[PDB]
Design an enzyme around this catalytic site. Structure first.
Site, PDB file in Angstrom:
ATOM      1  N   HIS A  37       6.863   7.686  11.407  1.00 49.59           N
ATOM      2  CA  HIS A  37       6.759   6.305  11.864  1.00 49.59           C
ATOM      3  C   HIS A  37       8.107   5.808  12.228  1.00 49.59           C
ATOM      4  CE1 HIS A  37       2.734   5.711   9.538  1.00 49.59           C
ATOM      5  NE2 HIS A  37       2.589   6.341  10.704  1.00 49.59           N
TER       6      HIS A  37
ATOM      7  N   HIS B 242      10.512   6.665   8.915  1.00 47.79           N
ATOM      8  CA  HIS B 242      10.127   7.299   7.643  1.00 47.79           C
ATOM      9  C   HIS B 242       8.954   8.201   7.899  1.00 47.79           C
ATOM     10  CE1 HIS B 242       7.490   3.717   7.957  1.00 47.79           C
ATOM     11  NE2 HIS B 242       6.577   4.564   7.469  1.00 47.79           N
TER      12      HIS B 242
ATOM     13  N   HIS C 125       5.190  10.233   6.249  1.00 49.60           N
ATOM     14  CA  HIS C 125       4.102  10.412   5.296  1.00 49.60           C
ATOM     15  C   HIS C 125       3.694  11.869   5.325  1.00 49.60           C
ATOM     16  CE1 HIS C 125       3.613   5.993   5.100  1.00 49.60           C
ATOM     17  NE2 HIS C 125       4.030   6.082   6.381  1.00 49.60           N
TER      18      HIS C 125
ATOM     19  N   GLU D 268      -1.561   9.869   8.378  1.00 51.33           N
ATOM     20  CA  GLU D 268      -2.262   8.607   8.124  1.00 51.33           C
ATOM     21  C   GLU D 268      -3.305   8.403   9.219  1.00 51.33           C
ATOM     22  OE1 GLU D 268       0.761   5.575   7.206  1.00 51.33           O
ATOM     23  OE2 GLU D 268       0.186   6.135   5.105  1.00 51.33           O
TER      24      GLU D 268
ATOM     25  N   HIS E 296       8.495   5.626  -2.276  1.00 49.33           N
ATOM     26  CA  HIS E 296       7.204   5.941  -1.657  1.00 49.33           C
ATOM     27  C   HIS E 296       7.319   6.779  -0.425  1.00 49.33           C
ATOM     28  CE1 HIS E 296       8.403   1.797  -0.475  1.00 49.33           C
ATOM     29  NE2 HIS E 296       8.117   2.226   0.769  1.00 49.33           N
TER      30      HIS E 296
ATOM     31  N   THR F 209       1.072   0.193   6.984  1.00 48.78           N
ATOM     32  CA  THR F 209       0.171   1.030   6.171  1.00 48.78           C
ATOM     33  C   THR F 209       0.576   1.104   4.692  1.00 48.78           C
ATOM     34  OG1 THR F 209       1.315   3.122   6.468  1.00 48.78           O
ATOM     35  CG2 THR F 209      -0.263   2.482   8.235  1.00 48.78           C
ATOM     36  N   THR F 210       1.655   0.414   4.310  1.00 55.60           N
ATOM     37  CA  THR F 210       2.007   0.172   2.900  1.00 55.60           C
ATOM     38  C   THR F 210       1.972  -1.329   2.594  1.00 55.60           C
ATOM     39  OG1 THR F 210       4.385   0.145   3.519  1.00 55.60           O
ATOM     40  CG2 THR F 210       3.512   2.187   2.601  1.00 55.60           C
TER      41      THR F 210
HETATM   42  O1  LIG Z   1       4.179   0.225  10.129  1.00 57.36           O
HETATM   43  S1  LIG Z   1       4.766   0.856   8.927  1.00 57.36           S
HETATM   44  O2  LIG Z   1       5.128   2.271   9.223  1.00 57.36           O
HETATM   45  O3  LIG Z   1       3.821   0.737   7.784  1.00 57.36           O
HETATM   46  C1  LIG Z   1       6.123   0.090   8.572  1.00 57.36           C
HETATM   47  C2  LIG Z   1       6.430  -0.259   7.319  1.00 57.36           C
HETATM   48  C3  LIG Z   1       7.673  -0.959   6.865  1.00 57.36           C
HETATM   49  C4  LIG Z   1       8.886  -0.871   7.537  1.00 57.36           C
HETATM   50  C5  LIG Z   1      10.011  -1.528   7.027  1.00 57.36           C
HETATM   51 BR1  LIG Z   1      11.651  -1.422   7.963  1.00 57.36          BR
HETATM   52  C6  LIG Z   1       9.978  -2.273   5.850  1.00 57.36           C
HETATM   53  C7  LIG Z   1       8.792  -2.385   5.129  1.00 57.36           C
HETATM   54  C8  LIG Z   1       7.646  -1.751   5.612  1.00 57.36           C
HETATM   55  O4  LIG Z   1       6.508  -1.873   4.907  1.00 57.36           O
HETATM   56 ZN   LIG Z   2       4.653   4.556   7.621  1.00 55.72          ZN
END
Ligand SMILES: O=S(=O)(O)/C=C/c1cc(Br)ccc1O
Ligand SMILES: [Zn+2]
Length: 257
Positions: free
Chosen positions: A116, A91, A93, A103, A61, A195-196
């Site tokens: 992020h 990571h 988006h 986002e 993703h 946000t996932t």
């Molecule tokens: O705040 S986020 O950028 O959505 C972080 C997401 C996230 C980070 C990690 Br590490 C593992 C699972 C996740 O869903």
């Molecule tokens: Zn993210």
């Protein structure tokens, strides 16, 4: 499973993850005129000098760069935060076109992408415990706009062809995440969520005002990644962003005038 397509995308997630329609979901639109400057915010401290990067992974993703978080090596403190939050991963988006991909939005403006940097509160001992807490994570969100190349993004871009498909990883040691930061640390902050899926409501969001500029060539290489695994037909990894969610009973605070 969940994804970003017509049949498994953000409008479907609430069926497996009912918190998707919760009281503090992310991302949100940041209305710059209604965000409140907050004098009680302490200075933001981003301490990445000892960061230890490990590996880069296409997780189906997004792609993620992972860090050694067994000690206080790369931490975020200050701002709205109490205590010390350790960097675990970053990571991105991004969109299929330069006009979409972020986002968070800013007065409804979408940027080409969003970074992020995810951190967890060390009073909770590990990431999995931290996500079960309302103040478990602090995520630093940084917008990307297309213009001049970002030198400190290039080592990331150059390894993407080695992790084209879901589940592929590569060594990614000695990467300095300081090269992804803009000049200014001015930010907006609000309580939100991952946000996932699982969309857990455990995140203090700190979104920087200043975007970084990346080149068209850099973002084009993001868009050559695949959502699919090796030996499956190609589905380009693009538009892996959740749209803005209802602000509900929250105020966004600004660190600056
Ligand atoms: O705040 S986020 O950028 O959505 C972080 C997401 C996230 C980070 C990690 Br590490 C593992 C699972 C996740 O869903
Ligand atoms: Zn993210």
């Amino acid at each position: 499973h969940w994804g970003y397509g017509k049949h498994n995308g953000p409008e479907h997630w609430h069926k497996d993850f009912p918190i998707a329609k919760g009281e503090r979901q992310s991302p949100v639109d940041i209305d710059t005129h209604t965000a409140k400057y907050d004098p009680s915010l302490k200075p933001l401290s981003v301490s990445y000098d000892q960061a230890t990067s490990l590996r880069i992974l296409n997780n189906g993703h997004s792609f993620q760069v992972e860090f050694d978080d067994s000690q206080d090596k790369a931490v975020l403190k200050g701002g709205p935060l109490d205590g010390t939050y350790r960097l675990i991963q970053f990571h991105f988006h991004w969109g299929s076109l330069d006009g979409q991909g972020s986002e968070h939005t800013v007065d409804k403006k979408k940027y080409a992408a969003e970074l992020h940097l995810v951190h967890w509160n060390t009073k909770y001992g590990d990431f999995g415990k931290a996500v079960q807490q309302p103040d478990g994570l602090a995520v630093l969100g940084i917008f990307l706009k297309v213009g001049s190349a970002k030198p400190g993004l290039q080592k990331v871009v150059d390894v993407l062809d080695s992790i084209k498909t879901k589940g592929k990883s590569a060594d990614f040691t000695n990467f300095d995440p300081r090269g992804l930061l803009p000049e200014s640390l001015d930010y907006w902050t609000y309580p939100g969520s991952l946000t996932t899926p699982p969309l857990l409501e455990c995140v203090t969001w700190i979104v920087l005002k200043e975007p970084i500029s990346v080149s068209s060539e850099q973002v084009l290489k993001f868009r050559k990644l695949n959502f699919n695994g090796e030996g499956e037909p190609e589905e380009l990894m693009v538009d892996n962003w959740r749209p803005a969610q209802p602000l509900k009973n929250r105020q966004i605070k600004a660190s600056f005038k």
